[PDB]
RNA sequence: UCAUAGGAUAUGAGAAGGCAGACCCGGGGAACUGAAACAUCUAAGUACCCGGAGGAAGAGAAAGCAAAUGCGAUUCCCUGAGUAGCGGCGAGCGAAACGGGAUCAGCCCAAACCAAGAGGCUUGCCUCUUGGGGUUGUAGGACACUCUGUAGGAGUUACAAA
RNA sequence: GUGGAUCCUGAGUACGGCGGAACACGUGAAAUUCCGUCGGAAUCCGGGAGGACCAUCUCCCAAGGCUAAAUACUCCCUAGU
RNA sequence: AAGCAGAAGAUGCGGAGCCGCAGCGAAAGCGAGUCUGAAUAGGGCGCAAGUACGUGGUCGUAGACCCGAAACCAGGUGAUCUACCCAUGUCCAGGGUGAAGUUAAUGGAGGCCCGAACCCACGCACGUUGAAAAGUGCGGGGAUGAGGU
RNA sequence: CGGGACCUAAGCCGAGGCCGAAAGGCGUAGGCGAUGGACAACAGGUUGAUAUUCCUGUACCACCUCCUCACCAUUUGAGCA
RNA sequence: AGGCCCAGGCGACUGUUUAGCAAAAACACAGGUCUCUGCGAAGCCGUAAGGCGAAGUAUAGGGGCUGACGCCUGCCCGGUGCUGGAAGGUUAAGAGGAGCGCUUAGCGUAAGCGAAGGUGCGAAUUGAAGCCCCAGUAAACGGCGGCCGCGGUCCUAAGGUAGCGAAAUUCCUUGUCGGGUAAGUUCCGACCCGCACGAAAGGCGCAACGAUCUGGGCACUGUCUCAACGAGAGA
RNA sequence: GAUAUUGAAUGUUGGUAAUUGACCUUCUAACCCGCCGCCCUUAUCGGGCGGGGAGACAGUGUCAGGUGGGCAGUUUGACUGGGGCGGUCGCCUCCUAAAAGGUAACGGAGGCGCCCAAAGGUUCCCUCAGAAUGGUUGGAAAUCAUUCGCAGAGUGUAAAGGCACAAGGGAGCUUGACUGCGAGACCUACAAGUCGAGCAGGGACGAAAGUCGGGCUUAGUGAUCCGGUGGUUCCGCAUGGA
RNA sequence: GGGGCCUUAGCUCAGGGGAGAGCGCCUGCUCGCAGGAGGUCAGCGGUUCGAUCCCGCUAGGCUCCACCA
């Protein structure tokens, strides 16, 4: 009842379902695996669950979309309890490239919901994808094309997963509109339009307040400029102005 | 309901209030001031208020002082000594014992136990009330022993009281 | 006076924690004394003190009571300086 | 010294105690030396007339040469003045206006109007060792009210 | 006549009682307390000085019974209350 | 036994106030609004008992602000307050004793080791409100921009809406123009470069009301030109 | 919030070997009732008795944390061409300063609150700035070479006084940037501050003489109280320890 | 008048070792792109081998004071 105030109105939908997962694990005494929750939904679930203990894993370490196990004070989980299947994406790499957009578009095109897959890993040697095991055979059978590339999926173990733009700058304040204008290299009035409309995020939360103060180590996501991180804040310079370090993806 | 609360009556040289503007013992307790300011601290447990007294009060017969081939209740005086110490180690506060004097005095219980009676029988146990018994420290007492006294000694200032 | 078979010798006490006060002694190395609060002994093969504390030794026997004198003071009365 | 005896005296007794005769060192301690230091060195401090009483000067603690605050604190005394309240009384000449309601009339509302008593205190003058430690005179405001007493 | 031997208001006091280092604070029963309620005397005269107070005349109120008269009644029995 | 009139500021009004230099534009007020308060109410007095609140009960009671009436009351919740609250962080006494010191029966040629007890400290762990933190809230405390050419740009929590404006606010200032006068630093009406108005510390109006403040008229006069004489009180 | 007053059960979850904790719910009997009936009793007080409500909570005590101008005691510097505001406050150097020393003003100029393990000690050796003339890059200015050249440089750093038998530059070896001190001086109200030959211990460099107790000199610092750490033939409240 | 803070390209801004972003503007381009322009670093003298940077002055502008009589 008195949790919704701290989150967004749209985020209420997830919080209701997050409470329903906590309802199970307390009363019934069993682990509840979730369908790959978004980076934001990881933060929300962490709060809603409370301290029912919580574990999270999206296959490899540093996955955006991860599946969450809600377990009690016993039955500490394993890697395979998350029910993750990795695949190597096979294609005629010498003749066609697969990009992240094409592969993401193809996964969505076969009707796969965003919650049924984790990260899409691009290395120098491999293109790999992580899905929920319950959808593995469907994805392997249906994902036959990504963009212009004919593709096939080879099952691999999670152990076989083949897992910056440093920009020292100054800003007058640590407000969202100020930091965005500096990062994106725009006028502030234009940057305020990005925030107010609801295009900027801060750690995957849609911040619509221009005056929101940005902390050290916050993933900002300007729809237009992509994604970027305030990594270091190193005090004020001469004539005020915070020293800051930006790192675009 | 038994009761008890309450009510009534009788007997009380029972209390009450005052003051000597003093002294004494308690309850409560300032501030100015000093510290060259000020808060700890000081002034001060003072002034003041309150309670209780008594001709005095308080203290008093070692769970003491001490560190000797010791002392032997308390109180007060001299001295120790403005020492030891305490202290925004500042301002200041400040002993005690030993030693020398005044004065001198020591006692009664509680308990064990005994006897008698009473009311709870908890049913030969327990609790209570009288009288006896008993009074302390290199322990004493009960308890047992054998002694011994029951009228010389003591006394209304404690040690019973007219 | 002699004996140590048993029994008795002051309990919500002593003491301790916490908070205060009193001790010349301001929380200090702080004994000692008292108050509130809470906790809480041993009981003679026992207990206390000797300025934290322990051991040894020494001195003592608390948690009941009474007790003159030496001391203080003078509204008064008498005599006097 | 207290104390005892003695005129409230002198004085006698009283040697506990006090200061001095030895210092040096934080101290154990050593001693005409001692401390520092490894040191027979060097250096520091010492070595090589006090005391009891009296008068006087000054100082300390006391109000401390005298007079003087504004203040602070403690315990009392005051609401016979005044502020507000409570209970109970009482006062307010006269005139005017004319709400509601009722059937133009009737009716008689009001922190209503004019205006004495009464209450107040706006202006000016006078008074200013006053008639008066706040008034008087001429005007002024309220005057059935949140009224006066 | 005004006040008391009548009544109560505000308030005040307050047996027991409640509360509080002490002193005390509060308060019930019960009282006290007019500025209010109740309550029988008037006119005239008089002194240097009092007058519903004295005097004259004419009244009224409460209470009393040595008495008088009438009426009612002695346990469903007057009457008082 | 009323002087009257025109126009403006302030306050709606009758009231109230600095006994004894201020009666006013100050206070109050009806009305508005916010907020607290479920009754042993909140609030208040008292150490308490006992009370007021109230012999009341949310159409009631307390507190804050505003101040008839009319039209209205904009933007900002970053800060502070108030209300509520999820994760995460922090935090007392008390609880809890892992360890350690001192002591010494014993043990050791000594040096030193050292049981048990006593005693002196004591770490982890546990530990509320609160705070950090999050959300809301402006008739809560408050705040309502610069610079450059309606646009840009910087900055902010957000940059002053309506209305008003040289004002009880305007320094410059006797602003400027008009009115009124022979002549008007005052007054009235506009203007707006508001030094430094502005919406319940309300904004703007506003009939009635005022021993209010302000400007102008009629009437009237020894106030004056400019004094004279007379009466009385004192001299 | 803990703890006392403060009890009984049922669950559940700790920690010790079946007792004791933690928390949840329930109970009634403490505690509470500004609720009703009855009695004391003519009584809206109080008390008793019986219902009811609530209940080991509350209240109250002790202890603890938070909040707390509601209230209390206080502090809130001095200099100063009046005070406020501004500036300043200690140390070093120069000038004022009148040829010893000292000397004031909110007089005139600047520095300091360090730095260096060599930028210290010693032994040995050395001479700088700049210019002229010549030079592939290369220039006014890098690097040579020549001559001239009291210093026109350098000296960690402000300034003054010094310094070329160098106190300036280079190299080797070192730690005297020593311990105990100290005749005697300077300065000085005191507290402090400064210089010091020389003696002893044990060293460094040097063949030796000798020099060395930091630095060319003069700033680079802060009393006491209190507390920490290391050392210690000291004390240790009966004695041994602590 | 006294303190304080500023003055970088046309504009806004980076910063003891030699002045850069982005914008404007310019180029040629199929309305975003490639590349260029633009600097007494407000003025000055001096500390330094070097100064936009330290240091002291000097304009100009912004902010706050200019009070007691
Ligand atoms: K004081
Ligand atoms: K003083
Ligand atoms: K103590
Ligand atoms: K205790
Ligand atoms: K003893
Ligand atoms: K000597
Ligand atoms: K002599
Ligand atoms: K003398
Ligand atoms: K004197
Ligand atoms: K007023
Ligand atoms: K005029
Ligand atoms: K002057
Ligand atoms: K050398
Ligand atoms: Mg003083
Ligand atoms: Mg007596
Ligand atoms: Mg007597
Ligand atoms: Mg006695
Ligand atoms: Mg007797
Ligand atoms: Mg005894
Ligand atoms: Mg001892
Ligand atoms: Mg006071
Ligand atoms: Mg009185
Ligand atoms: Mg009175
Ligand atoms: Mg009227
Ligand atoms: Mg009168
Ligand atoms: Mg008046
Ligand atoms: Mg009138
Ligand atoms: Mg009468
Ligand atoms: Mg009373
Ligand atoms: Mg009584
Ligand atoms: Mg009367
Ligand atoms: Mg009558
Ligand atoms: Mg007469
Ligand atoms: Mg008015
Ligand atoms: Mg007045
Ligand atoms: Mg007046
Ligand atoms: Mg109450
Ligand atoms: Mg009441
Ligand atoms: Mg107002
Ligand atoms: Mg508003
Ligand atoms: Mg907020
Ligand atoms: Mg005129
Ligand atoms: Mg205003
Ligand atoms: Mg407002
Ligand atoms: Mg107004
Ligand atoms: Mg009026
Ligand atoms: Mg104050
Ligand atoms: Mg004082
Ligand atoms: Mg001064
Ligand atoms: Mg001056
Ligand atoms: Mg100043
Ligand atoms: Mg000279
Ligand atoms: Mg000279
Ligand atoms: Mg001190
Ligand atoms: Mg000892």
mmCIF file of C-alpha atoms (C1' of nucleotides) in Angstrom, chain F residues 40-41 50-51 53-56 92-94 102-104 127-130, chain G residues 1-3 32-35 44-46 63-67 240-242:
data_model
loop_
_atom_site.group_PDB
_atom_site.id
_atom_site.type_symbol
_atom_site.label_atom_id
_atom_site.label_comp_id
_atom_site.label_asym_id
_atom_site.label_seq_id
_atom_site.Cartn_x
_atom_site.Cartn_y
_atom_site.Cartn_z
ATOM 1 C "C1'" G F 40 -10.059 10.930 30.523
ATOM 2 C "C1'" A F 41 -10.718 15.438 23.008
ATOM 3 C "C1'" G F 50 -8.092 18.781 41.123
ATOM 4 C "C1'" G F 51 -9.736 21.887 37.300
ATOM 5 C "C1'" G F 53 -12.258 23.218 27.908
ATOM 6 C "C1'" A F 54 -17.851 21.683 28.950
ATOM 7 C "C1'" A F 55 -22.188 19.928 32.470
ATOM 8 C "C1'" G F 56 -19.859 21.135 25.492
ATOM 9 C "C1'" A F 92 21.691 4.820 23.557
ATOM 10 C "C1'" A F 93 20.999 2.349 27.916
ATOM 11 C "C1'" G F 94 20.352 -2.594 28.534
ATOM 12 C "C1'" C F 102 46.622 -7.835 37.516
ATOM 13 C "C1'" U F 103 46.981 -11.444 41.458
ATOM 14 C "C1'" U F 104 49.154 -16.855 42.615
ATOM 15 C "C1'" G F 127 19.330 -2.842 20.402
ATOM 16 C "C1'" A F 128 13.742 2.245 19.665
ATOM 17 C "C1'" A F 129 12.401 6.790 18.358
ATOM 18 C "C1'" G F 130 15.326 10.129 15.697
ATOM 19 C "C1'" G G 1 13.643 2.064 24.166
ATOM 20 C "C1'" A G 2 15.363 -1.088 28.407
ATOM 21 C "C1'" U G 3 14.093 -2.480 33.237
ATOM 22 C "C1'" C G 32 -6.311 1.048 35.283
ATOM 23 C "C1'" C G 33 -11.597 3.003 34.364
ATOM 24 C "C1'" G G 34 -13.544 11.054 34.126
ATOM 25 C "C1'" C G 35 -18.726 3.446 33.066
ATOM 26 C "C1'" U G 44 -21.736 14.006 40.827
ATOM 27 C "C1'" C G 45 -15.708 13.441 46.815
ATOM 28 C "C1'" G G 46 -13.823 8.977 48.700
ATOM 29 C "C1'" C G 63 18.072 4.191 33.478
ATOM 30 C "C1'" A G 64 18.912 5.550 28.394
ATOM 31 C "C1'" G G 65 18.626 8.160 23.471
ATOM 32 C "C1'" G G 66 16.082 11.932 20.475
ATOM 33 C "C1'" U G 67 13.683 16.554 20.227
ATOM 34 C "C1'" G G 240 54.784 -8.816 48.324
ATOM 35 C "C1'" G G 241 52.991 -7.289 43.936
ATOM 36 C "C1'" A G 242 49.925 -4.118 41.112
#
